[PDB]
Each structure stands twice: as structure tokens, then as C-alpha cells.
């Protein structure tokens, strides 16, 4: 499924240079649209 | 004039005037008017900054550049996006209401257009890059993600332009139509030329009534109503997704290098009206291109990689010829019959036959030969997609064990053939009335005894074969 | 250690170099540190670890926005740039709720984009200041630590025109991709120019240019679009260090990295203490450059700069960038970003289908030629591979080629005479007579005595074993041979083609794999042509 991207950050650990990672989706795009995009908070 | 459907408005204005020469019945209750009639000033209907806007897109000398307007009613100042083009008179507009009316919320989703855009092409990035399946696969998925449609299906439009479903993704409880084919005809010429120019087609409701459009009286001709995105289904496709059981469709052109080439399409239908906001079909938009961008570079890389294949299979042959006699060649693994795609193959050789695969018996191949002589004995070589179209007497009694046929000519007794079996027998699918199954047993009737067409690059590599051939034969 | 995972301990040491310079108050020996900082030897964890924060997590941004880092939870503010209170028109402080610095509306938004799963619909985010109204794009990441929040100032206008200018910077991206699209293909380089002029037409910098890596990771201009009256760079070659590994790995997370203005003050980001270390700034798309890039980008001459990756398949590789500078302070926005970004995707597609499609014509090529080789041999003495004119020099890119054969030397193009080739033998008998064969790079780091007689027109060699005295033998020259631009304490662009021209001094260019596939493809066929004679 469509993600935001994550960020790595490089570490070096155990001698090797790794791109640690900085820290579930079930509706598609179209209901995450509906749901974020409902203007009844501006009534 | 034309029909458009009735979840927009049309208005047709002259390009220097800006005074309408033409609007669809829907339009005063769609702009709160119900003023608006021939030949008013089409940016007293709009707020100030939205006359700018219009005025901006029309001296545009790329208007397309410039196609999602965002203006507003000057009656109720409910958000339409405008979406502009040229015809041969003035300039069309076709309005379709904004559901999102906070400005603040406008800007984010026009911004999310590009930024899901870029999310989908770079997970199609990711793929290996050696697999057309993978990526229709991948288009189909995201594409479902972005609309959320019930099926979303991907159709590839072969050499006879008939078409296949090659991909799909659907809801559970839905009939599958993947590895379907359906006729030519059910695309008609027009509506491909359409989908080359409007690369997005959307019917939000097929049983919606549409909306006529009144036009000018002093009009000569009527108005080009083609390149319009509220543009009304035909009532033949109407009633076709009405029988399918869709009502909402959201087709999109999948473009390549032919010069442009419609390799097919990839169409969202849903079981109930739908119109999803503008960003997401932007989004959709971005990533079809992006796709026929890929699609093209896999085509590209397969035409490469069965020439490659098809050189070391000459090779191996030249060096079975070398090794023993020419019959050598239809004995070991690396045979005739990996040269190119057929379901059977076979050599006569000094009056020995020698059949691999799917071959005709020993009298057929005679009878064959008897007739390749009498009709086509002035020739270097031939390939027939189906025996009976061609005229052979012997057809029938072949049967759709062997329909296509490719000869290579090695001398007045020596033949390569290359045969192949009728199509219907790699096809599978589950499946009067225009309905899906219909159109699938009308294909099955078009190609009832006619194989796969022979390509362009197999016969290429059957007349190497037989150059090569032809030569080591002279030498023996 | 591979090469670009060597350059890490060169870029560390690099860097501890410019910062001791800066300490001290003394200037950047740029070719002398290159000198004296040569890969390998050993450097400390802590060094490297050292540099990886500073360049992550340096705490500084570039004043043309600000940031604030919230709490995922409690919304509540733990860093925050120190520009804030002035970008926003500003209370501001540690603890703070960052839902007050905003209208309600867009306090809304704000919660409705941090309560998002894996994907959210509001990033960025169209946001208004609660005391000014100054309109704000605030981009939305997140960090081990919380939410960072990049507030870019967004032009005061109608909200029309804001949507116009989105959709006329996407319009354009669309209409360059579509350019790209129709090119007659099988052209890297026609690619690469096209790519160039549409991305100058799209962003409107005063240069714009694409750089390629090399295997040796280093970098060459491969195209440019510039203004009349600014030098021309193509052509030129660099170092590989002057783009450290990390920035590269930054530039593969950030694909399009924009400085406004490298003489503008980095703002320090004041951080909540009770944090275990300095906010990390990987995502965030107002981090400053470091004063090494800085340092370099006045020198050059450019004020402002946009670095797009080229990431094409290969786990991802950077081909290169695609970098636009200009010789003024250029701030372009988000949504023209967004529209590059997107074009640099379809230039990596199409770039990556180049790349496959070049890849399968370079097989081709070198079967046929192995082929007619085979061919001539068969049906011809063996001095037929090289008296006709598909010799064994057309099977690979080199500047010359030998066949040695039972004492008859047959030289092609550049090669060394009779007793250099001679020498060369004795030495591969001496040192390497328990192989088939070898490439090198250069002679003189290969450790043969005598390479330097050899001078630069032979430098690389593929000699193949054909037997124990017939061999076969490709010759290269010096990289600068091929290598031509109309142009070293200072970081000014001449001094990185200087150390680049002293780095390849007697190398020629390596020898790529398919190349020494195809040599031993052709050698295993003549040594059994030969076996069976
Ligand atoms: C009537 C005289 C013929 C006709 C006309 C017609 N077709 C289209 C476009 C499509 N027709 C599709 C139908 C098929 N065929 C199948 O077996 C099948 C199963 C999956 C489908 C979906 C098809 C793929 C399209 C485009 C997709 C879509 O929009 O749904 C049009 C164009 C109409 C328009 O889009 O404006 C016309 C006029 N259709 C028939 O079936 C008759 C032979
Ligand atoms: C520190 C002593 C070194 C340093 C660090 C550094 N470089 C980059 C990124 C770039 N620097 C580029 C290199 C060159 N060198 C040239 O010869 C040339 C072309 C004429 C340029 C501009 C380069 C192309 C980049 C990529 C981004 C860009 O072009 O602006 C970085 C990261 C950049 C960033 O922070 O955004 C760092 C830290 N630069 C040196 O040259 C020193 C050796």
C-alpha cells in the first residue's frame, strides 16, 4: 500500500554503516480522503 | 448539440469576446443562476479573480498548461474547477463543482495530487524491471488505492486490436475478469482515437440522464463536443455497463512509442455512481503516465532479450548442423521448435518426415505440400494464421489441432514448418445481450479456427533459419 | 571495504580537517587535504560516529522557514528554530502547545495530519499563523523523538492563484516528461540534454547541469544548461570526495534538497534538555548545509542551489543529480518541488531503460565480434584476429591491442614495442603466472617495474593467457587523455578538476565487467581453438 516516506538515519555500529530506520492503513486513499477532508469542522 | 453527463456543466464561449455561444440545460441550476444566455459575457458569471483566471488561460497559448481553474460563482460562490480547451469555434469550459470548499483544504489536495503521484511512480520504481505482469500488477493495486473503485482492471490491445484482461483487482465477492478477450469492435476506432487524445475518461453514473447541449443558432456546424471531459456515453455503452453490472467507469489510456501507440487501457469500474475529487484522478493521471513510461521501457528490453534468445537458438543449430546431417536439427532439445513460439513443428527432409510436437500425420503433411506446390510454388517461404482462411483444402479434416502454419523453403522437397494451434486453446475464463460473456463468445467465434498471428520478429528468425539452412544444404 | 563504504573514513577525516581550519582560523587547504587524506589507513569509531551526527544532526536550518518538533501525543512543543517567533510573528517556548500557534482550522488540520496510520492526506499542510495570518506550507515528518513540522512561508495571495501556480508547475513536468517520451531513444546523452533544458525551463535557475557517478564514485557533468555569459562546465570531472557518502545517502532520502541562500545565517534549533541528543534533521528540508558545501558554493560563485537525485534501479542506486545553481539567493515553491520531483522520476525511469537497452546492444556487439573473430581463425591463420579489420581491439573499448604468438609480436593501435611487451611478459611470469589473466587499472600501482616508461599512452591492461608464452593483450591510456574541460587551495570547481587530474594521474579507466566477461569469453574459445592445433 501507498506510505509516507520513512527516514533513515546512518549509524555506525559493529563497523558497519547502517541505515537505521527513525522509529496499519486498511481504508483506501479515497476514504482517508473523505474522512480528512470533512468540512463540518468549519460549520 | 452533443450530450454531457449530468454531474457537470458545459459553457462554450467565443475566444475573443469571451460572450457565450453555447452551454449545456444544467448550467443555471449547477451556477445557482436559476443570467445566463447567448451571448453573455461569461466572466460576469464568475468572481473578478475568477475572470482574470479565465481571461489568463485564454490568451494561454498552451491552455492545457493551465486546465484545473479554480473560480467561483459570482451567485452563490461555490468553487468549480474549470477545465479548459479549444475547438474550432471558441473556447470550452467544463465546470464541475468542488467538493471541497475551504480554500485552505483546496491548496493541500491540489498538492496532494503530485505528492501521491510521486508516492505510486516510486513504488513502481522498485520493481526488478524485466517483468510486464509485476507492473500491471503494481498499476492495477495502486490504482484501486488511489479510487477505490470496485474492480480495476488493466486491457492490452493485441496486433488484431482485440483485447485482453491482463491484470485485476477486484472485490471479493465480484466475477473475476482477468484472462478474458473480448472482440475488437467493443472498442470502436473513435473511442481509441478519444483515449489517445483524452488519455482520462469518466462516467460517474451510466444511468444518469444526460443533459443537452443547447448551442447558438448561428453555429454552421455543430459543436465539437469530443475533446470535453462531461462528454455522454453512447447509449450502446450505456446499456453494456448497465448489463456488467457497473454503473461508474474510469478508464485510462496507456500510451507508448509506436507516433503514439494505445498499448490499452487501465478502467476503474464501480457497481454504483461514483466521481472521485480531482486530486486523486490527477494522482491517477500522473501514475498512468509514469506507467506508459515503463511499459514501454519493458517492451523495449523484451524485444532485445528474445532477439538475444533467438541468436543463440540459431547458433545451437548451426552447430547441430555441423555436428551430424540437417535432420539433426528436429532430434536434439534445442530444436526447431524453441526458435519460435508454435505448438509443433516439423522438417521433410530428402521425402523423410520428421514432426515434433503438434504435426500433421505423414498424408496430411503430404497434402500440404501437394498444395503449397500447386498454389505457391513461386515463393521463398509463407505463413497463414489459419489454414482455412488461406484455402487449404485439408484444413477441416487438420481440426484446431493445427490452424497456423509457417513454411520456410529450403529447396523443392526440403520444408521447415512451424505450426501452431487455434487460439481458444491458451484462453481461459469462466464465462443477444451486450454482457461480458457475450463479448467473450463472440471472440471465441472471431478466432474459432485461426491461431495467433506470427510476429514480425519470428518470421525474421524463421528466414535466417533458412538462409542458414538453405547455405549449409548447398554446401552438402 | 568496497569504495563508497572506504570513503566514509576519508569524508570523516575531511571534515575534522575543515573543522580544525575553522577553529584555528586558518583557510581550507582543499588540495592538500585531498593529498594527505588518502583512503584506507584507520580511523576511530568515535570519529565516524562524530561526523555522522554532525552531519544528521548538526542543529542547524536555513532561516528561509522554521521548524518546530512536537510531541506525537501531547502536541506539546520540545524544539523549536530559534527564527520561530519571528516567522511566526510572535508565547513560544518548551512545553508549549502547538495547536495555540495556529488558527483553529489549521489546528484541526495539524491533529487530523498527526493522527494518521501510515499515510495522511494533509502533508503539507495549508496553515495560517494564529497572530499574523501569514499563510504557511508545514511539512509533516517524523523523528525517533516526535513530529517535525517545516514551516515554509507561503506567498499572500488569492487561494486560486495558489492553486494556478501548482498546477502550472505540474502542467510543465508533465509536458517535459512527455517530451521525454518522444525521443528516438537508444541516446543517453539526448536524454540527459533534454532533461536539462526542461528542468532550467521548469525551476528558472541560472545553471542547471546533471552530474553522473562513476564506478569510482566519482563525478562528471554530463549536460548543462546555463546562462551566456556564466562559464561553461561540462565536461568536467571531480572527485569523488567532494559529495561524501553521507550527503549522497541524504540526497537518496531528500530527492529534492533546495538552498536558498548559502551567506544566509544558520538559525540554531533549540531543543527540549531532557532529549538524549541533538535533534535529528535527516528529513527535514530547511537543514543547512555545513560550512564545507557553504564554503564551496561561494567560491563557485552560487548563491543558491536544487540538488534532485537521479535513483535508478539497481535497492536503489544514485546515478547522480540533477543540480540547479544560481548566482543569486532563489527560494522556488513546495509544489514547483513536487512537479521536479516527479520529473526526475520519469528522467530515472527512462534513464534506467537507457542503461538495460545500452547493457543488451554492448552484448550483441561483442557476440557478433566474438563471432567474426571465431570465424577468421577457423578460416584463417591466427594472425587473422588481428591483420583485418574486425581485430580483437574492436572487442572492447581500449586505446590499443596485441597478440603475442610464438614469439611474433602483433601490435594495434597504442602498445608497447617489441622489448617494453617483452617486459611486460617476463613481469606477468614472475608475479602472475598462477592466473589466466588480469586487469589493471595502471601499470604503475600494479606494481610492474617499468610503467613509468610506458609513460601515459599505456597505463591499463587486460593481457588474457592464451597459453605460457602466446597472450593477448588490451591497452588504455590515462584517463586525461579522454578527459577535456576548458579550465589549488581554494574549493573553486578548477581545484576539484586539478586533485580529480591528480587522482587518475596514471590510471586508465577501469575495466568493466561485461568488458572482461567478453575478453574471457573470447579466451576460453581461442585457447580451445589453439589446444586442439
Ligand atoms: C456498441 C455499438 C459497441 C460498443 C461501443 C463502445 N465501447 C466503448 C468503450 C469500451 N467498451 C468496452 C467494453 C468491454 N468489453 C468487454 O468485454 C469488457 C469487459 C471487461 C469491457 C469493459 C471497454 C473496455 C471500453 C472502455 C472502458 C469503459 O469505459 O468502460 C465505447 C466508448 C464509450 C465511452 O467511453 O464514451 C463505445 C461507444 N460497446 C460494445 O460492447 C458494442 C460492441
Ligand atoms: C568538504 C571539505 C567538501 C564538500 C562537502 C559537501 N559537498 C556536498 C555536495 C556537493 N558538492 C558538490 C561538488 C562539487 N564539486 C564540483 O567540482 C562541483 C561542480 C562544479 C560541485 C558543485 C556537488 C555537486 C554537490 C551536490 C549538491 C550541490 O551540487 O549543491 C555536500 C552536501 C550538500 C548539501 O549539504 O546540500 C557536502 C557537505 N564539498 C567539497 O567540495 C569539499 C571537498
Same mark, same amino acid.
Given at each position: 500500500?501507498?506510505?509516507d516516506?520513512e527516514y533513515?538515519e546512518?549509524?555506525?555500529?559493529?563497523?558497519?554503516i547502517?541505515?537505521?530506520g527513525?522509529?496499519?492503513?486498511?481504508?483506501?486513499?479515497?476514504?482517508?480522503?473523505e474522512?480528512?477532508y470533512?468540512?463540518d469542522f468549519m460549520? | 448539440g452533443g450530450?454531457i453527463?449530468p454531474?457537470? *456543466?458545459?459553457?462554450?464561449?467565443?475566444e475573443?469576446?469571451?460572450?457565450?455561444i453555447?452551454?449545456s440545460?444544467?448550467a443555471?441550476?449547477?451556477?445557482?443562476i436559476?443570467?445566463l444566455?447567448?451571448?453573455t459575457?461569461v466572466?460576469?458569471?464568475?468572481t473578478?479573480?475568477?475572470?482574470?483566471? $479565465?481571461?489568463r488561460?485564454?490568451?494561454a497559448?498552451?491552455?492545457?498548461? %493551465?486546465?484545473?481553474?479554480?473560480i467561483?460563482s459570482?451567485?452563490?460562490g &461555490?468553487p468549480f474547477?474549470?477545465?479548459? !480547451?479549444?475547438?474550432?469555434?471558441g473556447v470550452?469550459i467544463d465546470?464541475?463543482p468542488?467538493?471541497?470548499?475551504?480554500?485552505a483544504?483546496?491548496?493541500?489536495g491540489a498538492v496532494?495530487?503530485?505528492?501521491?503521484?510521486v508516492?505510486?511512480?516510486? =513504488?513502481?520504481?522498485?520493481?526488478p524491471?524485466?517483468?510486464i505482469?509485476?507492473? *500491471?500488477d503494481?498499476?492495477?493495486?495502486?490504482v484501486?488505492?488511489?479510487?477505490?473503485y470496485?474492480?480495476?482492471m488493466?486491457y492490452?490491445? !493485441?496486433?488484431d486490436?482485440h483485447?485482453?484482461?491482463?491484470?485485476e483487482?477486484?472485490?471479493?465477492?465480484?466475477?473475476?475478469?482477468?484472462? $478474458?478477450?473480448?472482440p475488437?469492435?467493443?472498442?470502436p476506432?473513435?473511442s481509441?482515437?478519444?483515449?489517445k487524445?483524452?488519455?482520462?475518461?469518466?462516467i460517474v453514473?451510466?444511468?444518469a440522464?444526460?443533459?443537452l447541449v443547447?448551442?447558438?443558432?448561428?453555429?454552421?456546424q455543430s459543436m465539437?463536443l469530443?475533446?470535453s471531459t462531461?462528454?455522454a456515453?453512447?447509449?450502446c !455503452?450505456?446499456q453494456?455497463?448497465?448489463?456488467?453490472?457497473s454503473?461508474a467507469?474510469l478508464?485510462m489510456?496507456?500510451?507508448?512509442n509506436?507516433?503514439?501507440r $494505445?498499448?490499452? %487501457?487501465?478502467?476503474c469500474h464501480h457497481t454504483?455512481?461514483?466521481?472521485?475529487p480531482?486530486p486523486?484522478?490527477?494522482? *491517477?493521471?500522473?501514475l498512468?503516465?509514469?506507467?506508459?513510461? =515503463?511499459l514501454?521501457?519493458?517492451?523495449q528490453l523484451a524485444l532485445?532479450?528474445s532477439? &538475444?534468445?533467438?541468436?543463440?537458438?540459431?547458433?545451437?543449430?548451426?552447430?547441430?548442423l555441423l555436428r /551430424?546431417?540437417?535432420?539433426?536439427?528436429?532430434?536434439?532439445?534445442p530444436?526447431i521448435?524453441?526458435?519460435?513460439k508454435?505448438?509443433?513443428?516439423?522438417?521433410?527432409? +530428402?521425402?523423410?518426415?520428421?514432426?515434433?510436437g503438434?504435426?500433421?500425420?505423414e498424408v =496430411?503433411?503430404?497434402?500440404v505440400?501437394?498444395? %503449397?506446390?500447386?498454389? +505457391?510454388? /513461386?515463393?521463398?517461404?509463407?505463413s497463414?494464421?489459419?489454414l482455412?482462411?488461406?484455402g487449404?483444402?485439408?484444413?477441416?479434416? %487438420?481440426?484446431?489441432?493445427? *490452424?497456423?502454419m509457417?513454411?520456410?523453403?529450403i529447396?523443392?522437397?526440403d520444408?521447415?514448418?512451424?505450426?501452431?494451434?487455434?487460439?481458444?486453446?491458451?484462453?481461459?475464463?469462466?464465462? =443477444?445481450?451486450?454482457?461480458?460473456?457475450?463479448?467473450?463468445q463472440?471472440?471465441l467465434?472471431v478466432? &474459432?479456427?485461426?491461431s495467433?498471428?506470427?510476429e514480425?520478429?519470428?518470421?525474421?528468425a524463421? +528466414?535466417?533459419?533458412?538462409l542458414?539452412?538453405?547455405?549449409?544444404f548447398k554446401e552438402?
Open positions: 500500500r501507498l506510505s516516506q533513515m546512518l549509524v555506525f555500529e559493529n563497523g558497519q547502517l541505515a537505521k527513525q522509529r496499519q492503513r486498511t481504508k483506501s486513499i479515497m476514504d482517508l480522503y474522512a480528512e470533512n468540512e460549520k | 450530450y453527463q454531474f457537470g *456543466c458545459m459553457i462554450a464561449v467565443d475573443s469576446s469571451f460572450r457565450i453555447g452551454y440545460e444544467n443555471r441550476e449547477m451556477l445557482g436559476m443570467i444566455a447567448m451571448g459575457d466572466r460576469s458569471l464568475f473578478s479573480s475568477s475572470s482574470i483566471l $479565465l481571461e488561460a485564454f490568451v497559448r498552451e491552455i492545457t498548461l %493551465l486546465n484545473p481553474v479554480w467561483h459570482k451567485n452563490t &461555490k474547477y474549470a477545465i479548459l !480547451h479549444r475547438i474550432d469555434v470550452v465546470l464541475e468542488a467538493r471541497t470548499e475551504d480554500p483544504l483546496s491548496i493541500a496532494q495530487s503530485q505528492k501521491l503521484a508516492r505510486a511512480i516510486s =513504488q513502481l520504481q522498485a520493481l524491471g524485466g517483468d505482469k509485476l507492473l *500491471c503494481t498499476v492495477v493495486e495502486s484501486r488505492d488511489l479510487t477505490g470496485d474492480r480495476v488493466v492490452k490491445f !493485441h496486433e486490436e483485447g485482453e484482461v491482463v491484470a483487482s477486484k472485490r471479493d465477492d465480484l466475477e473475476p475478469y482477468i484472462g $478474458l478477450h473480448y475488437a469492435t467493443d472498442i476506432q473513435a481509441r482515437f478519444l483515449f487524445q483524452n488519455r482520462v475518461r469518466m453514473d451510466c444511468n440522464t444526460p443533459v443547447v448551442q447558438d443558432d448561428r453555429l454552421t465539437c469530443v475533446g462531461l462528454r456515453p453512447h447509449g !455503452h450505456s453494456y455497463m448497465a448489463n456488467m453490472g454503473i467507469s478508464a489510456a496507456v500510451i507508448i509506436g507516433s503514439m $494505445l498499448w490499452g %487501457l487501465v478502467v454504483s455512481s461514483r466521481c472521485i480531482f486523486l484522478r490527477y494522482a *491517477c493521471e500522473f498512468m503516465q509514469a506507467f506508459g513510461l =515503463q514501454n521501457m519493458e517492451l532485445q532479450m532477439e &538475444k534468445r533467438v541468436l543463440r537458438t540459431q547458433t545451437l543449430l548451426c552447430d547441430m /551430424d546431417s540437417p535432420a539433426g536439427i528436429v532430434t536434439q532439445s530444436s521448435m524453441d526458435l519460435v508454435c505448438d509443433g513443428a516439423a522438417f521433410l527432409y +530428402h521425402g523423410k518426415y520428421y514432426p515434433l503438434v504435426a500433421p500425420s =496430411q503433411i503430404k497434402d505440400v501437394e498444395w %503449397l506446390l500447386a498454389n +505457391h510454388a /513461386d515463393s521463398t517461404g509463407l497463414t494464421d489459419s482455412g482462411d488461406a487449404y483444402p485439408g484444413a477441416a479434416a %487438420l481440426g484446431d489441432a493445427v *490452424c497456423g509457417a513454411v520456410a523453403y529447396t523443392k522437397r520444408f521447415l514448418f512451424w505450426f501452431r494451434s487455434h487460439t481458444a486453446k491458451e484462453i481461459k475464463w469462466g464465462g =443477444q445481450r451486450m454482457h461480458p460473456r457475450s463479448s467473450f463472440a471472440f467465434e478466432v &474459432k479456427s485461426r495467433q498471428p506470427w514480425t520478429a519470428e518470421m525474421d524463421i +528466414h535466417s533459419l533458412q542458414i539452412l538453405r547455405d549449409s552438402s
